[PDB]
């Protein structure tokens, strides 16, 4: 059984680049530096994995009304991922021939170019996670991508507390609550699901897994099937399977952290506020905490400021739409503020404070589905 | 107190971004991390330098009907370049006010945003070379950019022989000859100049200087004035002065590297040849030198190949337009070959060889104005 097929370059390249995201250079299992190719009577699959994530991309032999693959001999092989990827991108013709010969030597031909790669026995490649493909949650691709974008940036990048490097996905009463935090700032996104109200899940998905999944999903409204087990999550979309290992442990309870009342409320043009916070962040120095100060007082006055000794300082006034409540002087990280503002989509934002030392909230007016929280910097 | 003016943001940002190319983060002359600003009754100049390269950009107060600058008080200041550049790009309004006050503390205001920077006395800033009145040679901007593109990549990056880190510019009988080499490969570029025939120059310009110069030159054919002295070269373009220190010493004679006679001559499609050598370079293994082999015999076909033990191999046939002379098997660095082929603009190239051990030449057929020479890889 020596694998042999002819395929369209464009589709081959697309599948290889999708699975390449699951291949890590640093790997304790040597065969995981390869891509597994399996040609069957129905088409060809490509698999890449790093043990944490696995990506399987399938190319059907025929799609629409065009012949994409011609399989002369079904079979399988493992090829080194980086070399295979670099080769396929540069093949000269629209048609590519892939043929395994003896001792796993694999021929890749296109036009007058012929590559030979030292293949490996695909029976040595690890099997995909075996999961009961049941109780799938369905989410439109565009909503899934936005859920990820509005939360994943807030996970910790430290492996000190691994559970905080993932996004908590909690499903109860047909509602999904996605929470990400690094103990300094927090992002929460809520979404209604079309599932039985009795279904319950509480898992933590690595932020890296969700960022890579979003890179392989297109901007469309097709339903993604999500199967959650005790230790894995499977995302199925058209011609693709994306598996991720879940992080073990109990995610911390952050519901007490989100304030339900406020002392000061600001409504301000989003772009105006973002541009001013961005300007206030420009005199940041390495080996020094860059902090920005916000002063607010009814009815419409905001002063943004920062100082960097021996470099300079900045002050800027902004006119708010509305300011209600107590006068406030608060300091915070401009990076966290800018990260939150970047994921909010409205013309204006609502910022809700409870004095200078408690967490504050950033939201879109009249939208209860997204909440950004930032812990301020204590000043003395 | 001192310098004070109002300027258009767009022109301020353009000038700052041009001079920032001469500012080094690793300078050992502290004031050279700054940008010198000088406001006079005619306009404002901006200068950046690393002691080898200096760039001065000028903004006239008026251009026809539009007022670009309003100078309330002439004067000068030095501001930290990186901070200044980051600030000016983000100012909120089309108009910017810059005002030096006491202790060199400088205000940068636009709309309701006010920055203060710790300025430095501009009298400590080094002076530029005073060479604007010596004889100039003129070159269209596009031709100048192309002659840099077609030569600077071949200079040495090693400091063992510093003269080889620059491009030799030899002017004689109204023609410019540019030579660059690193002892492994060589680029030769000839350009006709519209200057008196008795003008003579022979200097070596640092490769880094020409790379930075090209970044500030636009895609047009306006004449650039070039003033060459013993230790400095000045390039003058619209509102910009670019100075470079020249390298001291005698540039080596490279005429003898070219074999007097060729034994094999190939004429091939540039793009097909470049694409095949690029494919042959893909199985490189770190830290081994990438080697590609070319086999040529009259009456077709050129064979490009490479072998990477334990990874794979590649073989590609190319149909040459013409092959004359001896059968040849030669090996070379694909990096040098691709660098050379990427600067040739003809649909075809002529490749001339004198066996496997001597240098080979790459030229456009029926033209000697661009000559690329590469030493092959010695095999035993
Ligand atoms: Na420009």
Query: Measured between CB atoms, does A317 come within 8 Å of chain B?
Result: yes
Chain B nearest C-alpha distance from A351 (Å): 21
Distance CA B91, CA B113 (A): 7
Q: Considering only the beta carbons, identify the residue of B115, B276, B313 that sits closest to A116.
A: B313
- In order, the DSSP letters of B188-257 are EEEEE--S-TT--EEEEEEHHHHHHHHHH--SS-PEEEEEE-SSEEEEEETTEEEEEEPPPSPPPP-GGG
CA distance linking residue B209 with residue B152, whole number of Å: 10
End-to-end CA distance of chain A: 74
A116 neighbourhood in chain B, CB within 8 Å:
312-314
Contact assignment for A314 to B115 by CB distance below 8 Å:
yes
Structure tokens at B101: 């006050």
Q: Residue A168: helix, strand or coil by DSSP?
A: strand
Spacing, Cα B218 to ligand 1 middle (Å): 7
Do residues A155 and A181 touch, judged by C-beta distance below 8 A?
A: yes
Of B83, B91, B313, the CB nearest to A283: B83
CA distance B147 to B144: 5
- Asked if A288 is an interface residue toward chain B (Cβ–Cβ < 8 A), one would say no
Using DSSP, state whether A26 is helix, strand or coil.
Answer: coil
Centroid of ligand 1 to alpha carbon of B239 (angstroms) = 10
Cα–Cα distance measured from residue A235 to residue A54, given in angstroms and rounded to the nearest whole number: 11
Q: Which of A180, A185, A171 is nearest to A150 (CA)?
A: A180
Count the neighbouring beta carbons within 10 Å of the beta carbon of residue B152: 23
How many Å lie between the alpha carbon of B292 and the closest alpha carbon of chain A?
A: 14
The rounded distance, in Å, linking the Cα atoms of B258 and B250 is 20
Listed by number, the residues of chain B in 94-123 with a beta carbon closer than 8 Å to a beta carbon of chain A are: 112-118
DSSP assignment of A102-122 equals GGGEEEEEETTEEEEEE-B-G
Determine whether the interchain pair B83/A312 forms a contact, defined as Cβ–Cβ distance below 8 Å: yes
- CA-CA-CA-CA torsion for A110, A114, A118, A122, nearest 10 degrees? 20
* C-alpha–C-alpha distance, residues A31 and A380, integer Å: 56
- The answer to whether B113 and B91 have CB atoms below 8 angstroms apart is yes
Which uninterrupted H or E stretch holds B337? Answer: helix B334-341
Q: Do B279 and A118 touch (CB under 8 A)?
A: no
Whether B303 has its CB under 8 Å from any CB of chain A: the answer is: no
Domains identified in chain A and CATH numbers: 1-140+207-246 (3.10.150.10), 141-206+247-380 (3.70.10.10)
Instruction: Classify burial at B231, counting beta carbons within 10 Å of its beta carbon; exposed 0-12, middle 13-18, buried 19 or more.
Output: exposed
Q: Which SS3 state, helix, strand or coil, does residue A212 take?
A: helix
Nearest 5°: the CA angle A25, B315, A102 is 70
Token duo for residue A62: 């025929």
- Put simply, the answer to whether B314 touches A116 (Cβ < 8 Å) is yes
Pairwise CA distance, residues B34 & B126, whole Å: 11
**CB spacing of A83 vs B312 below 8 angstroms:** yes
CB-CB contact of A71 with A5 (8 Å): yes
Euclidean distance between CA atoms A204 and A180, whole angstroms: 9
Distance in Å, alpha carbon of A258 to nearest chain B alpha carbon: 33
Q: What is the C-alpha separation between A99 and A71, in angstroms, rounded?
A: 10
* Residue of chain A whose alpha carbon sits nearest to that of B319: A112
- Give the pair of three-digit tokens for residue A269: 């043009």
Torsion-angle region of B227 (φ positive above 0: left; ψ -120 to 50: alpha; else: beta): beta
At how many degrees (to 10) do helices A207-216 and A141-149 cross? 140
| Residues contacting B253, CB < 8 A, separation 6+ | none
In this structure, chain A runs to a length of 380
Q: How far is A54 from chain B (nearest CA, A)?
A: 24
Chain A interface disruption, residue of B25, B115, B273, B318, most A CBs within 10 A: B115
Closest CA to A242 of A79, A18, A16, A63: A18
Q: How far is A377 from chain B (nearest CA, A)?
A: 22
**Contact predicate A186/A154, CB 8 Å:** yes
Using a 10 angstrom Cβ sphere, with 0-12 exposed, 13-18 middle and 19 or more buried, the burial of residue A63 is middle
* C-alpha dihedral (B6, B8, B13, B16), degrees to nearest 10: -40
Rounded Cα distance between A70 and A37, Å, is 15
Q: Which ranges in chain A belong to alpha helices (H)?
A: 9-20, 81-89, 141-149, 207-216, 270-280, 334-343
Question: Phi, psi (5° rounding) for residue B205?
Answer: -105, 130
CA–CA separation, B32 and B55 (whole Å) = 12
Separation between Cα atoms, residue B21 and residue B30, nearest integer Å: 17
Query: Tokens standing for A189?
Result: 């996104």
Q: What is the DSSP letter of B120?
A: B
Angle (nearest 5°) at CA A127 between A124 and A130: 160
Alpha carbon distance, N-terminus to C-terminus of chain B: 74
Q: Tell me if chain B has a CB within 8 Å of the CB of A9.
A: no
Contacts of A87 in chain B (CB under 8 A): 279, 282
Query: Which residues in A lie closer than 8 A to residue B115 (C-beta atoms)?
Result: 279, 282-283, 312-314
Resolution in A: 1.5
Q: Is A92 on the interface with B (CB under 8 A)?
A: yes
Point out which residues pair with B303 in neighbouring strands: B295, B317
Is some CB atom of chain A closer than 8 A to the CB atom of B311?
yes
- The residue written with tokens 């082999």 in the block is B293
Report the candidate in A361, A269, A285 with the shortest Cα–Cα distance to residue A320.
A269
Cα distances from B198 to residues A119, B201, B210, in angstroms, run 66, 10, 26
A357 to each of A155, A268, A336, A360, how far by Cα in Å?
Answer: 22, 22, 16, 9
CA of B216 to the centre of ligand 1 (A): 6
H or E, element range at B279: helix B270-280
At residue A145, φ and ψ (nearest 5 deg) are -60, -40
The span from the CA of B24 to the CA of B14, in Å, is 18
> Taking the mean position of all CA atoms in its chain, how far away is CA A121?
33
Task: Please give the interface size between A and B, counted as residue pairs whose CB atoms are below 8 Å apart.
Answer: 79
Which tokens hold the place of A82?
Answer: 């980086």
Q: How many CB atoms lie within 10 A of CB A97?
A: 17
Q: Give the Cα separation of B93 and B122 in Å (integer).
A: 27
Cβ contact A124:A31 at 8 Å: yes
Secondary structure tally for chain A: helices H, strands E: 6, 28
């Amino acid at each position: 059984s020596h694998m042999k097929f002819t395929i369209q370059k464009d589709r081959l390249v697309e599948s290889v680049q999708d699975v390449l995201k699951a291949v890590s250079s640093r790997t304790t299992i040597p065969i995981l530096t390869g891509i597994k190719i399996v040609a069957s009577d129905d088409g060809v699959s490509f698999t890449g994995s790093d043990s944490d994530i696995s990506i399987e991309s399938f190319i059907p032999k025929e799609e629409g009304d065009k012949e994409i693959v011609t399989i002369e001999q079904p079979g399988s092989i493992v090829l080194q991922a980086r070399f295979f990827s670099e080769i396929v991108k540069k093949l000269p013709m629209a048609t590519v021939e892939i043929e395994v010969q003896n001792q796993y030597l694999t021929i890749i031909r296109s036009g007058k170019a012929e590559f030979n790669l030292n293949g490996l026995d695909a029976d040595e490649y690890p099997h995909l996670p075996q999961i009961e493909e049941h109780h799938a949650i369905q989410i439109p691709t565009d909503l899934l991508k936005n859920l990820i974008r509005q939360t994943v940036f807030a996970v910790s990048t430290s492996e000190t507390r691994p559970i905080l490097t993932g996004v908590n996905w909690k499903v109860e009463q047909s509602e999904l609550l996605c929470t990400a935090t690094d103990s300094h700032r927090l992002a929460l996104r809520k979404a209604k699901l079309d599932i039985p109200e009795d279904r319950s899940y509480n898992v933590v998905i690595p932020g890296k897994s969700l960022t890579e999944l979003s890179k392989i999903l297109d901007d469309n409204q097709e339903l993604v099937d999500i199967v959650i087990t005790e230790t894995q999550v499977l995302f199925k979309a058209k011609n693709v399977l994306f598996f991720s290992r879940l992080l073990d442990g109990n995610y911390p309870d952050t519901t007490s952290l989100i304030p339900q009342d406020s002392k000061t409320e600001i409504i301000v043009n989003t772009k105006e506020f973002l541009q001013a916070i961005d300007r206030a962040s420009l005199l940041a120095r390495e080996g020094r905490n860059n902090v920005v100060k916000l002063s607010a007082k009814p009815a419409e006055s905001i002063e943004i400021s920062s100082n960097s000794p021996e470099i300079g300082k900045v002050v800027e006034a902004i006119v708010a739409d509305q300011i209600e409540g107590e006068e406030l002087n608060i300091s915070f990280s401009p990076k966290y503020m800018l990260d939150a503002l970047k994921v909010l989509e409205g013309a204006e934002i609502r910022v809700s404070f409870t004095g200078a030392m408690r967490p504050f909230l950033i939201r879109t007016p009249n939208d209860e589905t997204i909440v950004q929280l930032i812990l301020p910097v204590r000043t003395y």
